[PDB]
Design a protein around this ligand. Structure first.
Ligand SMILES: Nc1nc2c(ncn2[C@@H]2O[C@H](COP(=O)(O)OP(=O)(O)OP(=O)(O)O)[C@@H](O)[C@H]2O)c(=O)[nH]1
Ligand SMILES: Nc1nc2c(ncn2[C@@H]2O[C@H](COP(=O)(O)OP(=O)(O)O)[C@@H](O)[C@H]2O)c(=O)[nH]1
Ligand SMILES: [Mg+2]
Lengths: 36, 280, 434, 430, 57, 100
């Protein structure tokens, strides 16, 4: 139990952070430059 | 709704319960026993066969004028151990080469496995057929025991190579074809040991055995041994010389005596006596 | 005057190469023992090499850390077929671990593979390109194939690369660690290759099923079909024809933008000999068969999006006039639509040579066949399917440490997911009108 | 070529081994005299996996026997195929374990383990590239759990590179055999979770229960219980010894059989096990196989496989067959078990294809899986531990040989946490 | 008890001896037939039809 | 007759082929290599060789023995002269022979 929470806590810290990047890594290869 | 494993149980003959289930398992053995019977692998068919051939008919050749000569199928008896030397082909000794153990047996009924052959070991000046003391000769097994010619042989002392029971130099029934085959008779009476050289050997007279490559006497001692053919004693080579010392050193310098004539008594346990068949 | 060195990494790649080798040898008359029986001709140089003594050594390299895969080949009848040391044999398998196949045990073996490849290219002077098959959901294939993908780009540079990868089956798969090794291989393999191909197993399953009615197909038939495709692309490379296409003409006809280099190919017709008697097998009719979803060789429905590119190769007794006519038939159908900005994407070549059927095969003897390789945004879902799985089992850090202990960086996982989202949208933005 | 070693000790440990080698020889074709008389060609290309090479007269099985008393050893030698083991690996003490763990790990084992460590390393360095270690021992036995685990403990320190499996036999509450089964086992389970890579347990109660239910044998003998496992255990390495379509090694299992680092406890079942009832009346086909392999009463564990959720499961299919069924069979089974399969880690089933069939059978299935139910055994033992410890029953002769109650306190906390840690993931929802 | 040694061999193999008969607890009319066959051992060389494989008989 | 085989040449040829096998696999093996090759081709399984397999058996493991030289070795190996040889004995001389 002592080592349970610390291992689970950090991952959730990163895991939530990890899901943050994926929307943030969104570059649509010159979205409007095709027509622009 | 039938129930199984109902406490006390009968034999499968009755059909009280679980009868058929055990029956097939019971019935299977013969079927499995059938196929193992289909190919020759049964132990019972194995144990007996060894006795048959080994106990195959053997006829020791006659002796004329008590002059045992090379070729006459003779036996080797232990005079003190009251037994005849017996050979085995099945059991395998812990030897990389192909050598087989030996056993001395009390029973004196004649069997092939207890018969050997005395074929001239080496061409020599003695072209006349009567064997002479100190004329090289070899122990040969009967052609019936094994397909390949088998020769009895012994090697030297070794911490790694030693007798299984006696702890002395072992005697080996192998197929080697070197020095290790020779032997030479020697008269039992210690005094006559010198002037017997070249003399005829007479059947029925006690015979000792010594190894020319190593000079050790082949004798038997009261030590048990285990093999299929009942219980038996062991065979090995050694010198049971009378432990009492003889001051041979002063004999030479003073010169009263020579090394050739032995001054050390040799006990009976080495006693062997060649014997021929009862009738011609 | 064109030679191609083939690359196969992992046991699955070795199996596929083995299966394609029998057909390749047969289509050229070279006996299994390495001597062509006494009889464009004898110009086997395209796939094999001649000392001048009679032998025919293939220009292929087999790599594996698992001895089981190549122990058999060295034990088979063809034992004389392949160069003895040309099949580097590993000791311990990567055990499906991407890092182990990429970070711990792959380094000490990589040099050996590079040396052999360097040696082989010396004989050839007009090498068209390199052919590589690897398992994205397979450990040893991913890393060993991946690393070579990095080196070749720096060993030679501008030299093109054609990758034929086998992504994990969409619904029924064997391995469970595939989502990791797939993303990492997808993360890395992306920027070291020229084009890709879809090779999911279920598609070959159902193609063999509804076509051959084989309720019990195995991997040998899948490899047979794969090889048949492999014979397709190069066919114009070693067969005379009015319309010929070479490897160098791939980035010009199948790449709208450099990043998008993932293509899905289909082959047909696949018909049992018991059903071809009542079939005309016309060139035009087979044209339709290659465009509807069920005949696709990947578990994908092209109807979910437009079409960006499509390359058709023809070989047999076809005529060019029918090709435009039947193709003209396809443009009529409203069920297949391209993107707003791709007016011409058809690339058609004609090769007189017919397909060769190896003894004991499943496909019957036919006169006309076509290979379909189209660039369509329909690849959007496949990565997303992996995208959902990759997140679900990682958010709890399941199986996390088995990777880390081999040196794999913890943040490296973050980037891998970073790219997969980026690649998904790139197909997205190219699906809107002006 | 990546061979494993075998170190069997204790009254239970050696008895299991006696059967396994016999099974291995029969499959691999080596007579009692140690000479090879196999039939197939592929059986002479890998004998190194479980047999060495020596003078032209025999192949020496790399075996070691460890135990504190001579009586148990004396039986193995007289058993059939007892000529196989080389004498040099024979180590035996004269004191006897007495079912006391402390005596088995602290006092006596210290001055006998030195030689066994000596022999093991000598055997250890003989290999080219060792593949792993697989120790058979009994936690409830006095000689094994203490002496046996320590051999394991040293191995981990000295070779952190190789992997290790564990076939341990744990006592179940319904069947009671040793009055010290609770304690001695408890001290044992402590040193495996921190040191063992793969652990698959076997319960005596099942092995009896499978026999009379499936086999329905009236009076099966120990040979039956031992005999089944020996073939079963050799089923794990089938892909590791002969050719196969989808080669799969234990490490592949380790990576593909362990969800979290402290979740390496396994239970196994074997199929198709068919009783003498209808051998010729049944058809052995893949649909029959998968149906039996998920039977809750076929596994070698006492824990109910329907009171939890399945984490990971793998079977190294045996014999020639088409993949479609294998992919179709599991996928057919997997979706139909939406209640008993975890979700956050999808595709929780593996498959393998090693063509070689075991003798007399065409379809053979060997099963391993990490199931949440295993803790159900832990409750029974632990609950026993607390009851029998509160009164210091028999403790004073687990303390009089040089160990104090502190570690007892430490250990008992270990199981409870280990059980709890394995239950929270039961309710874990993404 | 005379206990002829011949019966011991016969009695043990019929009367629930504490052993097992050569891996016959995993048996399945006549079955030794040590079978073995791999893909490339037979398929690619022997040219055995893909459907021919399996085919229990 | 052109000439007669000389013993020393017998010593070299036996030696020459002998050292040839040591170039195979590991030192621990190289007796199974002689045993295992035999097992592959022997229908009788009794253990009786002939000339052809011997010339052949030498053929497999790179042993180009000349016909007249071929005959010299065979006789020297066998005191039976019956046209047969024991494999275990035949192997024994090749490796298990302390004396030249
Ligand atoms: N369709 C098809 N797939 C195959 C075949 N052989 C192997 N595979 C693929 O192999 C996967 C199983 O893992 P492997 O490919 O054996 O693992 P790997 O690629 O060798 O990677 P390592 O773990 O490092 O050995 C499956 O998902 C298949 O996609 C084949 O013959 N046909
Ligand atoms: N299934 C099975 N269990 C056994 C066998 N031998 C011993 N056991 C178990 O081992 C336990 C006692 O082990 P023990 O005698 O202390 O082992 P030791 O320490 O090595 O002497 C008993 O509860 C048995 O259930 C066997 O042959 N089969
Ligand atoms: Mg692999």
């Amino acid at each position: 139990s002592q080592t349970k929470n610390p291992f689970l806590d950090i991952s959730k810290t990163s895991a939530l952070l990890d899901s943050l990047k994926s929307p943030e890594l969104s570059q649509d290869i010159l979205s409007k430059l095709t027509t622009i | 709704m039938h129930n199984y494993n109902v406490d006390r149980k009968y034999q499968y003959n009755c059909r009280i319960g679980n009868w058929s289930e055990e029956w097939e398992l019971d019935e299977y053995k013969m079927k499995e026993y059938l196929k193992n019977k289909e190919k020759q692998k049964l132990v019972s068919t194995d144990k007996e066969d060894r006795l048959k051939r080994s106990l195959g008919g053997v006829n020791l050749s006659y002796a004329n004028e008590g002059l045992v000569k090379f070729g006459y199928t003779v036996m080797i008896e232990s005079d003190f151990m009251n037994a005849v030397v017996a050979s085995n082909i099945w059991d395998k000794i812990t030897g990389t080469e192909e050598a087989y153990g030996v056993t001395v047996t009390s029973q004196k009924e004649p069997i092939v496995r207890t018969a050997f052959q005395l074929l001239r070991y080496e061409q020599d000046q003695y072209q006349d057929d009567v064997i002479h003391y100190g004329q090289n000769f070899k122990i040969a097994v009967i052609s019936r025991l094994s397909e390949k010619p088998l020769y009895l042989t012994s090697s030297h002392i070794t911490p790694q190579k030693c007798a299984k029971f006696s702890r002395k130099q072992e005697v080996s029934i192998s197929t080697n074809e070197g020095i290790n085959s020779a032997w030479c008779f020697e008269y039992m009476d210690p005094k006559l040991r010198y002037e017997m050289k070249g003399q005829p050997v007479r059947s029925g007279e006690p015979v000792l055995i010594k190894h020319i490559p190593t000079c050790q006497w082949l004798a038997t001692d009261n030590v048990q041994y285990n093999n299929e053919f009942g219980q038996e004693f062991e065979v090995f080579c050694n010198s049971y010389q009378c432990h009492n010392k003889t001051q041979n050193l002063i004999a030479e310098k003073v010169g009263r005596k020579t090394i050739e004539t032995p001054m050390r008594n040799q006990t009976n346990q080495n006693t062997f006596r060649i014997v021929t068949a009862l009738y011609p | 005057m064109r030679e191609v060195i083939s690359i196969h990494v992992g046991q699955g790649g070795i199996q596929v190469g083995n299966a394609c080798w029998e057909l390749f040898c047969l289509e050229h008359g070279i006996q299994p023992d390495g001597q062509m029986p006494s009889d464009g001709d004898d110009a086997f140089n395209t796939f094999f090499s001649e000392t001048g003594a009679g032998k025919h050594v293939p220009r292929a390299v087999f790599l594996d850390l698992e001895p089981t895969v190549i122990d058999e080949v060295r034990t088979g009848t063809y034992r004389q077929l392949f160069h003895p040391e040309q099949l580097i044999s590993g000791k311990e398998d990567a055990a499906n671990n991407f890092a182990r196949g990429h970070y711990t045990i792959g380094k000490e073996i990589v040099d050996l593979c590079l040396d052999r490849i360097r040696k082989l290219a010396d004989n050839c002077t007009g090498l068209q390109g390199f052919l590589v098959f690897n398992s994205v959901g397979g450990g040893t294939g991913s890393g060993l194939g991946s690393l070579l993908l990095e080196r070749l780009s720096v060993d030679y540079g501008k030299k093109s690369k054609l990758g034929f990868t086998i992504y994990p089956s969409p619904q029924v798969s064997t391995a469970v660690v595939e989502p990791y090794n797939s993303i990492l291989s997808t993360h890395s393999l992306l920027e070291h290759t020229d084009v890709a191909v879809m090779l999911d197993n279920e598609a070959i399953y159902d193609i063999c099923r509804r076509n051959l009615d084989i309720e019990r197909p195995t991997y040998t038939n899948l490899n047979r079909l794969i090889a048949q495709v492999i014979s397709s692309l190069t066919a114009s490379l070693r067969f005379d024809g009015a319309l010929n296409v070479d490897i160098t003409e791939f980035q010009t006809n199948l790449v709208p933008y450099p990043r998008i280099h993932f293509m899905l190919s289909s082959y047909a017709p696949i018909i049992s000999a018991e059903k071809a008697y009542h079939e005309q097998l016309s060139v035009a009719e087979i044209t339709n068969s290659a465009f509807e979803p069920a005949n696709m060789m990947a578990k994908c429905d092209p109807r979910h999006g437009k079409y960006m590119a499509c390359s058709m190769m023809y070989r047999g007794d076809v005529v060019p006039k029918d090709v435009n006519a039947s193709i003209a038939t396809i443009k009529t159908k409203r069920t297949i639509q391209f993107v707003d900005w791709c007016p011409t994407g058809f690339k058609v070549g004609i090769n007189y040579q017919p397909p060769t059927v190896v003894p004991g095969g499943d496909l019957a003897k036919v006169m006309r066949a076509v290979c379909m390789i189209s660039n369509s945004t329909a690849i959007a879902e496949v990565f997303s399917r992996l995208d959902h799985k990759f997140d679900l089992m990682y958010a709890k850090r399941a199986f996390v440490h088995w990777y880390v202990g081999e040196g794999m960086e913890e943040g490296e996982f973050s980037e891998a997911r970073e790219d997969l989202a980026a690649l998904e949208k790139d197909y997205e933005e190219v699906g809107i009108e002006t | 070529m990546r061979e494993i070693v075998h170190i069997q000790g204790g009254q239970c440990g050696n008895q299991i081994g006696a059967k396994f080698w016999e099974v291995i020889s029969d499959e691999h074709g080596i007579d009692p005299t140690g000479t090879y008389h196999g039939d197939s060609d592929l059986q002479l290309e890998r004998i190194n996996v479980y047999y060495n090479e020596a003078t032209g007269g025999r192949y020496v099985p790399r075996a070691i026997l460890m135990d504190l008393e001579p009586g148990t050893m004396d039986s193995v030698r007289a058993g059939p195929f007892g000529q196989l083991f080389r004498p040099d690996n024979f180590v035996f003490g004269q004191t006897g374990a007495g079912n006391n763990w402390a005596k088995g790990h602290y006092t006596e084992g210290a001055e006998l383990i030195d030689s066994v460590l000596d022999v093991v390393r000598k055997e250890a360095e003989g290999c080219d590239c060792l593949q792993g270690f697989q120790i058979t021992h009994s936690l409830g036995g006095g000689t094994g759990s203490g002496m046996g685990t320590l051999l394991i403990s040293k191995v981990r320190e000295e070779y952190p590179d190789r992997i290790m499996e564990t076939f341990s036999v744990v006592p179940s509450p319904k069947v009671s055999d040793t009055v010290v089964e609770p304690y001695n086992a408890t001290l044992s389970v402590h040193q495996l979770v921190e040191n063992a890579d793969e652990c698959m347990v076997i319960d005596n109660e099942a092995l009896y229960d499978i026999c009379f239910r499936t086999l329905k044998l009236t009076t099966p003998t120990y040979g039956d219980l031992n005999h089944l496992v020996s073939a079963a255990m050799s089923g794990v390495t089938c892909c590791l010894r002969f050719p196969g379509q989808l080669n799969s090694d234990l490490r592949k299992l380790a990576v593909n059989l362990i969800p979290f680092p402290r979740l390496h406890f396994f239970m196994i079942g074997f199929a198709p096990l068919t009783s003498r009832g209808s051998q010729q009346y049944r058809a052995l086909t893949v649909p029959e196989l998968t149906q039996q392999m998920f039977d809750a009463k076929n596994m070698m564990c006492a824990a109910d496989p329907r009171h939890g959720r399945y984490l990971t499961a793998s079977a190294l299919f045996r014999g020639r067959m088409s993949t479609k069924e294998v992919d179709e069979q599991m996928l057919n089974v997997q979706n139909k078990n939406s209640s008993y399969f975890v979700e956050w880690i999808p595709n929780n089933i593996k498959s393998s294809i090693c063509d070689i069939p075991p003798k007399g059978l065409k379809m053979a299935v060997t099963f391993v899986g990490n199931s949440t139910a295993i803790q159900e055994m832990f409750k029974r033992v632990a609950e026993q531990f607390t009851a029998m410890f509160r009164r210091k029953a028999f403790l004073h002769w687990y303390t009089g040989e040089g160990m104090d109650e502190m570690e007892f306190t430490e250990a008992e906390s270990n199981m409870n946490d280990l059980v709890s840690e394995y239950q929270q993931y039961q309710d874990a929802t993404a | 008890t005379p206990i002829d040694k011949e019966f011991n061999q016969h009695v043990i193999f019929n009367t629930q001896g504490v052993q097992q008969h050569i891996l016959f607890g995993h048996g399945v009319t006549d079955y030794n037939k040590r079978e073995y066959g791999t893909s490339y051992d037979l398929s690619f060389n022997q040219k055995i039809k893909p459907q021919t494989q399996i085919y229990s008989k | 007759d052109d000439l007669a085989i000389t013993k020393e040449e017998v010593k070299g040829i036996v030696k020459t082929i002998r050292q040839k096998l040591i170039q195979k696999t590991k030192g621990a093996n190289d007796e199974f290599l002689l045993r295992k090759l035999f097992k592959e081709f022997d229908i009788s399984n009794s253990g009786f060789l002939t000339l052809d397999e011997m010339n052949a058996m030498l053929i497999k493991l790179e042993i180009p023995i000349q016909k007249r030289y071929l005959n010299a070795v065979f006789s020297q190996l066998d005191r039976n002269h019956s046209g047969v040889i024991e494999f275990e004995e035949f192997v024994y001389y090749i490796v298990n022979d302390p004396y030249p």
